[model samples]
Target: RPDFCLEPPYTGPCTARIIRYFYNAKAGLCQTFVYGGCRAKRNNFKSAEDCLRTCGGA
Candidate 1:
């Protein structure tokens, strides 16, 4: 959701040290995903809770 991208802590782009997670809309939750160490959509998160809490993905 837009809120995820608007969060102050996230400045955009994924870093290697950061374990990235994404909201899987079909699953209604967050799942572990590849981190390209580059900018990604707001669906990207640092943790599962971060993703789910923000997007409430399916």
Candidate 2:
């Protein structure tokens, strides 16, 4: 779903601090975040730029 990328990232209950990037709708860009390393949401991407293009009106 194209709309899938619009949602914010949700790093689940895991305690990992993996660096990640996710699209921020209101910011109109992608931002850095800490990933759960296990149950991160689909909004998470490989990098900030990667997340931007996928959901940043590219």
Candidate 3:
């Protein structure tokens, strides 16, 4: 099963989604790796706890 999905169940606004994903970025870290089921799978998450678990390492 997919880790994160995007569907009707989502409550947060589009701005929030973008902010949640892009709001934080430490210098030199490059891109923040967001994992899981997005629109492709049909779900969403707002916290790193939600996106980080699916990855292989810490």
Best by lDDT: 2
Q: For residues 1-58, could you state the per-residue lDDT of candidate 3 as single tens digits?
A: 2333212233332232342221112231112334333342223335545543432132
By TM-score, how accurate is candidate 3? 0.24
Any runs in candidate 3 off by more than 4 Å, and if so which? 1-17, 22-44, 56-58
Q: In terms of TM-score, which candidate is stronger, 2 or 3?
A: 2
lDDT at residue 8 of model 1 (Cα atoms) = 28
Q: Which pairs clash in the backbone of model 1?
A: 25-58, 26-58, 27-58, 28-57, 28-58
TM-scores of the candidates in the order shown: 0.60, 0.80, 0.24
Q: lDDT scores for all predictions?
A: 0.61, 0.79, 0.31
Q: Residue-pair clashes per candidate, as listed?
A: 5, 0, 6
- In candidate 3 the C-alpha lDDT for residue 24 amounts to 19
Q: Write the per-residue lDDT of candidate 1 for residues 1-58, one digit (tens) a residue.
A: 5545433233255456555777655666667766656766676777777776777733
**lDDT assessment of candidate 3:** 0.31
